[PDB]
RNA sequence: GAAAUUGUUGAAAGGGAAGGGCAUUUGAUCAGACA
RNA sequence: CGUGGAGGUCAGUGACGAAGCCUAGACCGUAAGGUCGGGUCGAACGGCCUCUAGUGCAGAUCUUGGUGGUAGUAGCAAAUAUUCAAAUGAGAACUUUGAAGACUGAAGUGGGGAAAGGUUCCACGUCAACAGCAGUUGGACGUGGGUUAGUCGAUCCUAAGA
RNA sequence: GUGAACAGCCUCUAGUUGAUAGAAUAAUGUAGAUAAGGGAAGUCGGCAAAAUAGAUCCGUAACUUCGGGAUAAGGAUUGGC
């Protein structure tokens, strides 16, 4: 493994990859980043709906000249699309991850997807024909992915340093007289 | 619930296919149609008799005829379970005109 | 260099930007001056543009080759049911301008208006007004009070009137809201006139008579995205051209480096507000009354309602103004009718019209027939029929 | 499934165009087994595959 | 297994570029020296 | 001041971690640079005196390689046209079959050849790449099979010419 | 088949139905059309576009190397039974 950052307690944790996915990266970004923190039952429901054009996935960095349309009010984006394979891709792993906590024991019911990362995997060269007798690169920009789940908790109780108060004569002084005199 | 009903509606494809086309008009009849069929049994599942089929293309692409007397029967889904249980069937009714009928329910057996 | 040869501009900038309007419901920015020697009345009013038709008259201008002949002139009809008063709002001087300082409604409100509050009434639990209407109960302490204050300051008062929508045949149910000077005399007067008519109703014929000169205030009929050449109709350009033609040519000197804010650009044409002035009323008609669409000199009972009915509108059962010629906006949409500004002398304003002939004739073809009466009488019998 | 082949030969066999052999698809994997033109000879003559007619060019409005 | 360049996480700043110099507030971080 | 290599020396450092790389951590130098900690790593390496040079880059429309913004953007619009159902299959707008609607209209989108290609032919299997959507299909991929002559061509003859 | 016709247009036999697809139909385009009254005033210039057209019959100037110019120009007619 050795997956990009994480913080969360593997012990209550499950996880999934693919690698060298031929899925646009710039798309299936964006559509991991519309479901990175989510509830993951949530999540499954709602990619869902992206393919029936029902909610869309907020495009918020790759998109410019994107299009605009009313199911992104949602996110308060205008531009916002329906990148289907992405979608399909990311519930694959979504679908594994959960396959890996269900082995693993865990709660599906407290099942979050804590990480999401996508990322750029080796580019597919192909060409193509420009006018006089000219070639140019055309190509495939693949993506790895990789997402973990953890079963919610609650509280985090307390616990901290105590602050080591240091105070010189005159500010001792004033606070042994600060009860001398009151409460 | 479900419900299981046929009737026999009319479908007025000429207002419909006004303006479109002529290259489209008979695609646009088969799509229209499936469209007309949701409508009336709530059922996103719709099947076309290969008999409606030819009754929409009779005449050519761009001459569909005005009005189609159609005979939409709503049944229940078997095998492998789809998102509904229930999906709709399609069949052309052998009418000498489609002029001019309301729309009835086949009583079922 | 200099333009060669000189031509004036094409389009008027005081009607920039040529953008979309912020609403159907054009703006009365101004109302007459206030005569607080004249009763209380209402100083504009709302209805719906129903369509066209034509008229024949006798002309009286003394000097005209037409003096004393009949003319053939084109008129609108707007419908114009009652409109119902359920609120006043009382304005102060500051120096910063009119502000608004109360807002007084009536206990009970019409569920056309209710439907204006929303955007998904279906769903809604209606509750608009339900407190405010509680006002009411205790004696009447609180909605006296604002009255009273609106009585003590208040420079200028205006009713909240709205529209009777379902005494027509559109099919929009939610009606339209709107604030209407009032310039009968004497601010106290005023909002007494105002409370009297809570709940109660406004008569066109109480606005607006025979002759009068009228403003119309509406949102422009719409088209969307458009050319240059239609826009602000520039010259087509030669036939030769590459790359198009309905277009400018030069969009600009090299300096100001910049398109400038005066040369014509394509996009959006259309749905503008608008004021048009000086619309001479033809006809109050009453809704109540068959041969509202006969004359003295007609006599045959009907309703100016074309046969098979306006295009694209309906009926007419209600009252109506009738203005000569035509008028901003478009069949179905919201229209505020302004009394004048000014004082007209003219002589075309003035002119006291009665009207000899309304054209009748069906407006989805090319009519041939006032009443199916006359078809019948001149068709004979058909195999339909008796 | 494919009867790809089997068309072709269907239309060699008995000597037409492929635009007027008929496979039915209810004997579908019937149809399939046969690799041969002994096996699609067997299928023609017991109307597994039939020999569809010749569209109608009349010359009556001529005449 | 560097760099350009990228994903994620964390921290921060952003009224028509950004980066830089002298100076100090505020946050973070740290050496030395006491004895 | 710094680099690769050489003579001498410190009986120098090192698998108990050399070298290298990373680090808005520490320290020395006005500076070139030097030193250390921590992480990573895995087999060699450095101080001083001297010797030596293919010895220090930001530029040269520099060389080779790698990478961006442009941008999910230009675009994927010529050649009239597609449709219903079944079957198959993880998956079917695109495969197979049936039905229907059309087209080429014999100056063919038919049936064959010459040059040129060289196995593309045919069967079976089959989808990682490839067919600028797809793909269960293919002129792709894997594995095989297939080209029968006294009479058809060559071979003989002569032409311009060699 | 129509027609002078190996033209164009429709068909039989055979072969295809290959050409990313869906939804809309803004501006500006590319390609295809029409436009009252006027009729080249447009423009370097009638560029583009429109007009004419097959056949049968009637009729046909200057000039000429006597061969032409000539479908000169200008007219009428044309289905079905
Ligand atoms: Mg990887
Ligand atoms: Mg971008
Ligand atoms: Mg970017
Ligand atoms: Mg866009
Ligand atoms: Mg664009
Ligand atoms: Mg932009
Ligand atoms: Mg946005
Ligand atoms: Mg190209
Ligand atoms: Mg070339
Ligand atoms: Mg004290
Ligand atoms: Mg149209
Ligand atoms: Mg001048
Ligand atoms: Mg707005
Ligand atoms: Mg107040
Ligand atoms: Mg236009
Ligand atoms: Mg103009
Ligand atoms: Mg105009
Ligand atoms: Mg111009
Ligand atoms: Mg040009
Ligand atoms: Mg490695
Ligand atoms: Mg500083
Ligand atoms: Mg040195
Ligand atoms: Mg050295
Ligand atoms: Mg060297
Ligand atoms: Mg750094
Ligand atoms: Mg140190
Ligand atoms: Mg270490
Ligand atoms: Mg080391
Ligand atoms: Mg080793
Ligand atoms: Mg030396
Ligand atoms: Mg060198
Ligand atoms: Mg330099
Ligand atoms: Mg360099
Ligand atoms: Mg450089
Ligand atoms: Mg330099
Ligand atoms: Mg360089
Ligand atoms: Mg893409
Ligand atoms: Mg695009
Ligand atoms: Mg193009
Ligand atoms: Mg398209
Ligand atoms: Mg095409
Ligand atoms: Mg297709
Ligand atoms: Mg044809
Ligand atoms: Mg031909
Ligand atoms: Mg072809
Ligand atoms: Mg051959
Ligand atoms: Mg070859
Ligand atoms: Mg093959
Ligand atoms: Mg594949
Ligand atoms: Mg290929
Ligand atoms: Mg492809
Ligand atoms: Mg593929
Ligand atoms: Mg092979
Ligand atoms: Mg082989
Ligand atoms: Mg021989
Ligand atoms: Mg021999
Ligand atoms: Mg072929
Ligand atoms: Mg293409
Ligand atoms: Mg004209
Ligand atoms: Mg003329
Ligand atoms: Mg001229
Ligand atoms: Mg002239
Ligand atoms: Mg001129
Ligand atoms: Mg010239
Ligand atoms: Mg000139
Ligand atoms: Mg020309
Ligand atoms: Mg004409
Ligand atoms: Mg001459
Ligand atoms: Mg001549
Ligand atoms: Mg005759």
């Given at each position: ?183 | ?109 | ?208 008579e025979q002759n009068e000169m009228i403003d119309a ?90 046969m098979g009915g306006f295009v694209h509108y309906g ?72 | ?63």
């Open positions: 493994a050795r997956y990009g950052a994480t913080s969360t307690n593997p012990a209550k944790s499950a996880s999934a990859r693919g690698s060298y996915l031929r899925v646009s990266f710039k798309n299936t970004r964006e559509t991991a980043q519309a479901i990175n923190g989510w509830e993951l039952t949530k999540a499954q429901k709602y990619l869902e709906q992206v393919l029936d054009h029902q909610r869309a996935i907020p495009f918020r960095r790759f998109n410019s000249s994107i299009g605009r349309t009313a199911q992104g009010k949602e996110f308060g984006v205008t531009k916002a699309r329906w990148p289907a394979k992405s979608v399909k891709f990311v519930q694959g792993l979504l679908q594994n991850a959960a396959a890996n906590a269900e082995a693993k024991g865990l709660d599906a019911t407290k099942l979050y997807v804590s990480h999401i990362q996508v990322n750029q995997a080796p580019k597919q060269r192909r060409r193509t024909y420009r006018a006089h007798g000219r070639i140019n690169k055309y190509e495939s920009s693949p993506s790895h992915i990789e997402l973990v789940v953890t079963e919610k908790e609650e509280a985090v109780a307390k616990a901290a340093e105590k602050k080591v108060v240091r105070l010189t004569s005159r500010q001792r002084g004033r606070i042994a007289a600060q009860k001398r005199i009151a409460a | 619930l479900k419900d299981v009903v046929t009737r026999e509606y009319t479908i007025n494809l000429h207002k419909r296919l006004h303006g479109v086309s002529f290259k489209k008009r008979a695609p646009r009849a088969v799509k229209e149609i499936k469209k007309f069929a949701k409508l009336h049994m709530g059922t996103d599942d719709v099947r076309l008799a290969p008999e409606l089929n030819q009754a929409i293309w009779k005449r050519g692409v761009k001459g569909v005829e005005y009005r189609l007397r159609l005979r939409i029967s709503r049944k229940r889904n078997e095998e492998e379970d789809a998102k509904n249980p229930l999906f709709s069937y399609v069949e052309p009714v052998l009418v000498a005109s489609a002029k001019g009928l309301q729309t009835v329910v086949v009583e079922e057996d | 260099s200099h333009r060669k040869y000189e031509a004036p501009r094409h389009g008027h900038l005081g009607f920039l930007p040529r953008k979309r309007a912020a609403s159907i419901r054009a703006r009365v920015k101004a109302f007459p001056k206030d005569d607080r020697s004249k009763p209380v009345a209402l100083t504009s009013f709302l209805g719906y543009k129903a369509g066209m038709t034509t008229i024949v008259r006798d002309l009286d201008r003394p000097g005209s080759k037409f003096h004393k002949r009949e003319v053939v002139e084109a008129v609108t009809v707007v419908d114009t049911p009652p409109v119902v008063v359920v609120g006043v709002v009382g304005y102060v001087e500051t120096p910063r301008g009119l502000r608004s300082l109360t807002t007084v409604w009536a206990e009970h409100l019409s569920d056309e208006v209710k439907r204006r509050f929303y955007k998904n009434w279906y769903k809604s639990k209606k509750k608009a007004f339900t407190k405010y209407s509680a006002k009411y109960a205790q004696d009447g302490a609180g909605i006296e009070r604002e009255l009273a204050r609106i009585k003590k300051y208040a420079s200028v008062v205006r009713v909240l009137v709205h529209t009777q929508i379902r005494k027509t045949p559109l099919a929009q149910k939610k009606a339209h809201l709107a604030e209407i000077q009032l310039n009968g005399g004497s601010i106290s007067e005023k909002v007494d006139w105002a409370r009297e008519h809570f709940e109660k109703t406004v008569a066109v014929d109480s606005v607006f205030i509406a949102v422009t009929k719409g088209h969307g995205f458009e050319g240059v050449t239609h826009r602000w109709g520039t010259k087509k350009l030669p036939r030769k051209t590459h790359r198009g033609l309905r277009k400018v040519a030069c969009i600009g000197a090299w300096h100001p480096a910049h398109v400038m804010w005066s040369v014509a650009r394509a996009g959006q044409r259309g749905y503008h507000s608008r004021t048009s002035i000086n619309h001479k009323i033809y006809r109050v008609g009453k809704g109540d009354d068959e041969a509202n669409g006969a004359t003295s000199f007609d006599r045959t009972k009907k309703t100016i309602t074309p009926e007419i059962k209600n009252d109506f103004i009738m203005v000569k010629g035509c008028i901003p906006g478009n069949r179905k949409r919201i229209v505020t009718l302004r009394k004048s500004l000014y004082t007209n002398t003219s002589r075309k304003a003035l002119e006291e019209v009665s009207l000899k002939w309304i054209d009748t004739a069906s407006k989805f073809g090319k009519g041939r027939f006032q009443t199916p009466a006359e078809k019948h009488a001149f068709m004979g019998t058909l195999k339909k029929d008796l | 499934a494919n009867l790809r082949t089997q068309k072709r030969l269907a239309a060699s066999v008995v000597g037409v165009g492929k635009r007027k052999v008929w496979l039915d698809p209810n004997e579908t994997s019937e149809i399939a087994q046969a690799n041969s033109r002994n096996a699609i000879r067997k299928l023609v003559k017991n109307g597994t595959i039939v020999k569809k007619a010749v569209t109608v060019h009349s010359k009556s409005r001529t005449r």
